[PDB]
Amino acid sequence: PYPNLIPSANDKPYSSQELFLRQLNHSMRTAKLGATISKVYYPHKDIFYPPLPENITVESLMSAGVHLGQ
RNA sequence: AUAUGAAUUAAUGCGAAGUUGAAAUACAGUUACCGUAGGGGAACCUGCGGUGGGCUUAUAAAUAUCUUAAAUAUUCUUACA
Ligand SMILES: [Mg+2]
Ligand SMILES: [Mg+2]
Ligand SMILES: [Mg+2]
Ligand SMILES: [Mg+2]
Ligand SMILES: [Mg+2]
Ligand SMILES: [Mg+2]
Structure with a gap:
């Protein structure tokens, strides 16, 4: 466990x-x-618990800020 | 009207080796060129306007800020919720 x-x-x-x-x-x-x-x-x-593609909603894309364009 | 000769006469092209100016091409050493005028044998020189086919080649008078800094973020591998 914790040697030395x-x-x-x-x-x-x-x-x-x-x-x-x-x-x-x-x-x-x-x-x-x-x-x-x-x-x-x-x-x-x-990064460690990304969702499956079928479970993605517009709301979760929007909360990630994917909708914000140039 | 038209052709053919013409004494004399105006211009222009070419070629051989040269000859003479320094006008253009660079800021070509006076920016070049267009138009027009005068001078000059001529190259060119000068006056007046125009054009860029020259200046767009353009490039600082400068100073910057406060919240839990970690037993807490940074770790994390489909987890939890
Ligand atoms: Mg000259
Ligand atoms: Mg000159
Ligand atoms: Mg003169
Ligand atoms: Mg004009
Ligand atoms: Mg020039
Ligand atoms: Mg130029």
Whole structure:
């Protein structure tokens, strides 16, 4: 998982790298608590979750700004 | 009317090797050319207007701004929703 990391001793505080891994553990579990986001555009998803050609509407072409000519 | 000769006479073409000016073609060294006039043996020179087939070849008196910069965007592979 995370080789070549030397933990700290229980007496002494978290180190910077231990803090990083700790907040990663927080980020993957509890940071996303409270609400789910819906109907919001995320730029990366056009690249990794493009729709199928049959599912494209005029509205989604317009929201992408395809209609704006010179 | 028309043809044929004509003394004399005007122009023009060509050719051989040369000869003389420096007018044109470059800003051709006075922008060229068109028209017209005078001068000159002539090339050309000068006056007046016109044209560009010469100047469109045209190219700065200059100064620029504030919001969560990241445990948050940048990662992401049909996922979620
Ligand atoms: Mg000359
Ligand atoms: Mg001249
Ligand atoms: Mg004279
Ligand atoms: Mg005129
Ligand atoms: Mg000229
Ligand atoms: Mg010219």
